[PDB]
Design a protein around this ligand. Structure first.
Ligand code: HEM
Ligand SMILES: [Mg+2]
Length: 153
């Protein structure tokens, strides 16, 4: 469980994310694909993009990163009261896209790296631990949901 001040730190840096959701999404996507290329194999629509600039230029990748970050922000603003928001994301990612919890750890790393690379002044050691606990909770809860749907990833 997170404290109230932990959630405040989480939402305080997310308000900075929401100034440019599309650019944060591009960066987190591209950091995901570069740090762990097997993850790009899950995107039939994006695994033809070969260089960084092709990813940056893809309107279709940009839109999708806004979609990703919008759903995550909605989860974070529920401060752990996210079953309603999390179940659809569990359904699709367990039974359709088939995303193991490691891929979720990979993107949590990407998120924390981009957050630090755009907002150091606002993402020091407490904010960074608070965001870390929030994403840990998301990964724990969504793993329990994966299991409920019969997916062991
Ligand atoms: C914080 C983590 C994540 C959040 C909040 C998130 C959320 C979403 C949302 C809202 C969509 C569109 C609707 C849906 O299919 O559920 C989506 C699509 C998708 N997501 Fe995730 N997602 C992330 C985890 C991942 C990871 C780790 C991968 C791959 C390694 C991945 C790739 C999948 C794929 C393959 C689609 C379909 C993309 C398409 O063809 O349009 N996602 N994701
Ligand atoms: Mg994605």
């Amino acid at each position: 469980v997170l404290s109230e001040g932990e959630w405040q730190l989480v939402l305080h840096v997310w308000a900075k994310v929401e100034a440019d959701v599309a650019g944060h999404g591009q960066d987190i996507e591209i950091r995901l694909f570069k740090s762990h290329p097997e993850t790009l194999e899950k995107f039939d629509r994006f695994k033809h993009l070969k260089t960084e600039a092709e990813m940056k230029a893809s309107e279709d990748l940009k839109k999708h990163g806004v979609t990703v970050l919008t759903a995550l922000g909605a989860i974070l603003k529920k401060k752990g009261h996210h079953e309603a928001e999390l179940k659809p994301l569990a359904q699709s990612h367990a039974t359709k896209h088939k995303i193991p919890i490691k891929y979720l750890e990979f993107i949590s790393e990407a998120i924390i790296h981009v957050l630090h690379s755009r907002h150091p002044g606002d993402f020091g050691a407490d904010a960074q631990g608070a965001m870390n606990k929030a994403l840990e909770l998301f990964r724990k809860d969504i793993a329990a949901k994966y299991k409920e749907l019969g997916y062991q990833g």
